[PDB]
GROMACS .gro file of C-alpha atoms in nm:
model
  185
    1UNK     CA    1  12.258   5.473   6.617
    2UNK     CA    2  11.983   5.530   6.320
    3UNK     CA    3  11.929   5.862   6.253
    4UNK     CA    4  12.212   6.093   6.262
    5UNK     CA    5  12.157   6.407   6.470
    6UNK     CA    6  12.382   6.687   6.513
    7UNK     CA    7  12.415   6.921   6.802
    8UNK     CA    8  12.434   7.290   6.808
    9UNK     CA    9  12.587   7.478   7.067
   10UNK     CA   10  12.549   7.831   7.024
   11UNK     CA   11  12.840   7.891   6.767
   12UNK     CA   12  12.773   7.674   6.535
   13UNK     CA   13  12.606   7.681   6.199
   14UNK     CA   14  12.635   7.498   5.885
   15UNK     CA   15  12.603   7.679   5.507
   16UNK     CA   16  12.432   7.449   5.230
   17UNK     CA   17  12.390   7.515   4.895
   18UNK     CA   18  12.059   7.267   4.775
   19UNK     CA   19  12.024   7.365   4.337
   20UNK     CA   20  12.350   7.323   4.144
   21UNK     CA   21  12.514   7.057   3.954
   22UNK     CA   22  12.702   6.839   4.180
   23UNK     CA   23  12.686   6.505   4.072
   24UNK     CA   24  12.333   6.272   4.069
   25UNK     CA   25  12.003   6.491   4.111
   26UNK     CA   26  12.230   8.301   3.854
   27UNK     CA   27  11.965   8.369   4.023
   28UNK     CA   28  11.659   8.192   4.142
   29UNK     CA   29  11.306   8.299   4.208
   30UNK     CA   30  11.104   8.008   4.433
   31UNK     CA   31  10.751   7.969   4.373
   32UNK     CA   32  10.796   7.779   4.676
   33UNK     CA   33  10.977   7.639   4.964
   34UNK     CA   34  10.938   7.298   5.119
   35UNK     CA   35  11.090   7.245   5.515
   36UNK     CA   36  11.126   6.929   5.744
   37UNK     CA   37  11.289   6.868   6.055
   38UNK     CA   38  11.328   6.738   6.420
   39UNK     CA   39  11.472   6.936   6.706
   40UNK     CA   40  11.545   6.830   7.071
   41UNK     CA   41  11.602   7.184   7.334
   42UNK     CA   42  11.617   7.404   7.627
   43UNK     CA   43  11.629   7.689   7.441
   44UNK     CA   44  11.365   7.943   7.441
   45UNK     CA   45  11.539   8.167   7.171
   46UNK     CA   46  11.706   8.089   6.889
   47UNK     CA   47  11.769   8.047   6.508
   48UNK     CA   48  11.720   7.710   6.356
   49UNK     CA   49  11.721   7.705   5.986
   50UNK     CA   50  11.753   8.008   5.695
   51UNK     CA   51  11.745   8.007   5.360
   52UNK     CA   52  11.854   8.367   5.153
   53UNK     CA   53  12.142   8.560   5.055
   54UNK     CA   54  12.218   8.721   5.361
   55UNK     CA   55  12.188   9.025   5.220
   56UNK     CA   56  11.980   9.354   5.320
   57UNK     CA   57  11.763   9.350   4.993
   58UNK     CA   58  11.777   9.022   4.985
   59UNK     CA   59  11.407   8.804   5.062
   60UNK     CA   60  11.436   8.525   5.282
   61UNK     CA   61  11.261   8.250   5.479
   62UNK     CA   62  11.329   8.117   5.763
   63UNK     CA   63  11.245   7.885   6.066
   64UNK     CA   64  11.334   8.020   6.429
   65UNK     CA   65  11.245   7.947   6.824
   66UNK     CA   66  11.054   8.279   6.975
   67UNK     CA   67  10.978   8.363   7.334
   68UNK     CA   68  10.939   7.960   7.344
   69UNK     CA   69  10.744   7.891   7.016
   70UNK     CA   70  10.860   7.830   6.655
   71UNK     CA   71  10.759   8.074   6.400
   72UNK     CA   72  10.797   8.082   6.052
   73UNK     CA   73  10.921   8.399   5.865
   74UNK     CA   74  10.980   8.556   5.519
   75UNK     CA   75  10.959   8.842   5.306
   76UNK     CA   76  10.939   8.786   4.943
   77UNK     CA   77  10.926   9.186   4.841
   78UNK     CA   78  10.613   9.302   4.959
   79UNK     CA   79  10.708   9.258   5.389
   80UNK     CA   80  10.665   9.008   5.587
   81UNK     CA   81  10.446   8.739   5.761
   82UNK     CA   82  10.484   8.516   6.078
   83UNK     CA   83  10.348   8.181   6.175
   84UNK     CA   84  10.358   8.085   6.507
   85UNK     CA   85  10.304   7.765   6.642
   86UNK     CA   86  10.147   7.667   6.969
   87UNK     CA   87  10.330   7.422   7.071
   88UNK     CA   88  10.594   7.454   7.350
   89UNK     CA   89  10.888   7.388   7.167
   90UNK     CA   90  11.101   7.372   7.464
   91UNK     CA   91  11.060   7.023   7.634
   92UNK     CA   92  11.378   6.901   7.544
   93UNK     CA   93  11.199   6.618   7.347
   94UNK     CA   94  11.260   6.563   6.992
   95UNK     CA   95  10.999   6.739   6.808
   96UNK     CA   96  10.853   6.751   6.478
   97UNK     CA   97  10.864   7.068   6.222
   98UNK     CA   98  10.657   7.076   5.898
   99UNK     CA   99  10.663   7.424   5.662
  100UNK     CA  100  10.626   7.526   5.356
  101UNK     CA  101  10.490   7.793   5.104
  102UNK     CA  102  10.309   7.852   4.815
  103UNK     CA  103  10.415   8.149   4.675
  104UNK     CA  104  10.225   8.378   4.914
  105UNK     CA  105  10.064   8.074   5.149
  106UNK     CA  106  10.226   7.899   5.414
  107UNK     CA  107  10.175   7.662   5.704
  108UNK     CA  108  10.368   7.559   5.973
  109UNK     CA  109  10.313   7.226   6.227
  110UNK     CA  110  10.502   7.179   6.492
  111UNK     CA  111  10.413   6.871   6.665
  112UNK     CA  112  10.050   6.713   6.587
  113UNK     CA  113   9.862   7.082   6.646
  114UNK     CA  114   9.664   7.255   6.334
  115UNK     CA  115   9.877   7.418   6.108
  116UNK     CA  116   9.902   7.740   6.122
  117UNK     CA  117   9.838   7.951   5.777
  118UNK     CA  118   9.869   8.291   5.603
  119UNK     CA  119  10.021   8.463   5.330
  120UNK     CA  120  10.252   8.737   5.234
  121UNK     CA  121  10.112   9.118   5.116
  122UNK     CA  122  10.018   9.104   4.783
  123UNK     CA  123  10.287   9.161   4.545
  124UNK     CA  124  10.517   8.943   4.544
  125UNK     CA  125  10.501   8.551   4.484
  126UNK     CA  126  10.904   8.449   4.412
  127UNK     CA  127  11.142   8.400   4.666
  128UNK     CA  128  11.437   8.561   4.528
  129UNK     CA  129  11.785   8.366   4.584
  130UNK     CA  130  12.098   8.150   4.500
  131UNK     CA  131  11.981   7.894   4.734
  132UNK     CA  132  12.205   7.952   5.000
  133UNK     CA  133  12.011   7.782   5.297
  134UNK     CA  134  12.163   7.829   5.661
  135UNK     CA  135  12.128   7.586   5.983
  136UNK     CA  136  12.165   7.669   6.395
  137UNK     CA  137  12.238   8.061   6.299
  138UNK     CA  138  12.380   8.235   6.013
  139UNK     CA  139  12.704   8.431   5.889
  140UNK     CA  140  12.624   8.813   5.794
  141UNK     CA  141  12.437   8.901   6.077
  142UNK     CA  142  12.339   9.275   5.994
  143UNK     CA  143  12.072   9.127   5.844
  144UNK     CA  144  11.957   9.109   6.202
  145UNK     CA  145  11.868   9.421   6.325
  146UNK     CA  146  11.552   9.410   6.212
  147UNK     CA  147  11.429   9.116   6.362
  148UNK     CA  148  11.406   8.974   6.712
  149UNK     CA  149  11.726   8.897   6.935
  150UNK     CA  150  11.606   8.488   6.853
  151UNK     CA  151  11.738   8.530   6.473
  152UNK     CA  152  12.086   8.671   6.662
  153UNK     CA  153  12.089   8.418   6.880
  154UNK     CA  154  12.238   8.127   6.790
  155UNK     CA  155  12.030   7.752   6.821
  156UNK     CA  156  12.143   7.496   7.155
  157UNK     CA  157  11.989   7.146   7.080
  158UNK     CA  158  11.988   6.913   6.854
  159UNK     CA  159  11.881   6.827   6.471
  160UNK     CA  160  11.816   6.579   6.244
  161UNK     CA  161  11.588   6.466   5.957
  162UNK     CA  162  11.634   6.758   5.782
  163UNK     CA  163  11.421   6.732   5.419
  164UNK     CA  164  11.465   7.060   5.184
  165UNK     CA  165  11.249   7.087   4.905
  166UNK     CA  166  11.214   6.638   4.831
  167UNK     CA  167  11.571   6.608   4.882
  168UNK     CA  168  11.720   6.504   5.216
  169UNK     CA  169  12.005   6.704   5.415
  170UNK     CA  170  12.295   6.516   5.492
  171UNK     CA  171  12.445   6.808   5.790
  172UNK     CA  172  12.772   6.664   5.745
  173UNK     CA  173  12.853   6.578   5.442
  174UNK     CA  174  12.643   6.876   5.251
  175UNK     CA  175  12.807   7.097   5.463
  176UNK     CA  176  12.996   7.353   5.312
  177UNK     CA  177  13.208   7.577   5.573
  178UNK     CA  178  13.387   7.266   5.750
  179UNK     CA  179  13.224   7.338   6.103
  180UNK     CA  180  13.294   7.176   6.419
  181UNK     CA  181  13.123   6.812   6.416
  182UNK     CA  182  13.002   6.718   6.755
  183UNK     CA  183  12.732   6.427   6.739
  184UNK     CA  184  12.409   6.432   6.982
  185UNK     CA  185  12.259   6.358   7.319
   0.00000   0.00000   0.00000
C-alpha cells in the first residue's frame, strides 16, 4: 500500500525516456542533472540508475552500489569524477538518495550524512544525450569494461520514489521495454 516500489532481481532493468512530447508536460546537452530515490538491499554491488546513450563516446551519469557504498559517476568529455557516500548502503532498510549536478559540481546524500561534492576536469559543462535514463542495470553493456564489476552487475532490492529532473518516475507505467513486473517486500 502507498508508495509503489518495485523489486529488482538481478535481470531486470527498466529503459525511460524523460524529454519528448508525450502528452501533458536530436540531441541534448544537460547543464544539469537532478536524481531522487529510495532503495531497500543486501547487495554490496550493483547498478541502480543510468542515464546516457549507452554508447562508447557517449557521456553519462550514473548512480551505483560499490564495495558497499553508493557513488555517483559521470564523464561529461573531459573524464570522470566519483562521489562516494559514507553511508552503509547495505542494511536492507529503505534508504534515501539525493544527487545532482551543476554542470561540473555535484553532490550526493545518501541518508542524513554531509553531502559529498566535486566537480568534473575542466572542459566540459554539458551532459551530452537523448535522455535515455536506465534503472537496476542497463542494455549495451560494453560500455562496461571500463568501470567496476558493480556497473555489470545487475541491482537486487528494491525502489521507489524515483524523482528525475522535477518530474516523478512512474517504473511501470514510464517504462519502455515491457519488463517483468514483480512488486516489493
Amino acid at each position: 500500500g502507498d508508495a509503489e516500489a518495485i523489486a529488482f532481481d538481478g535481470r531486470t532493468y527498466m529503459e525511460y525516456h524523460n524529454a519528448v512530447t508525450k502528452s501533458h508536460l536530436a540531441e541534448k546537452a544537460l547543464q544539469s542533472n537532478h536524481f531522487e530515490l529510495s532503495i531497500k538491499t543486501e547487495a554490496t554491488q550493483g547498478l541502480i540508475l543510468w542515464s546516457g546513450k549507452g554508447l562508447e563516446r557517449s557521456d553519462y551519469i550514473a548512480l551505483a552500489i560499490v564495495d558497499g557504498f553508493v557513488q555517483m559517476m559521470y564523464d561529461l568529455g573531459s573524464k570522470p569524477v566519483v562521489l562516494r557516500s559514507t553511508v552503509p548502503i547495505n542494511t536492507n532498510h529503505w534508504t534515501h538518495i539525493k544527487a545532482y549536478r551543476v554542470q561540473r559540481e555535484g553532490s550526493l546524500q545518501v541518508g542524513n550524512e554531509a553531502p559529498i561534492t566535486g566537480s568534473s576536469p575542466l572542459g566540459a559543462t554539458q551532459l551530452d544525450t537523448d535522455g535515455a535514463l536506465w534503472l537496476g542495470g542497463m542494455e549495451r553493456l560494453s560500455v562496461a569494461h571500463k568501470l567496476p564489476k558493480a556497473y555489470s552487475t545487475g541491482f537486487i532490492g528494491c525502489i521507489r520514489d524515483v524523482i528525475v529532473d522535477r518530474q516523478e518516475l512512474h517504473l511501470v507505467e514510464d517504462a519502455l521495454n515491457n519488463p517483468t513486473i514483480l512488486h516489493c517486500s
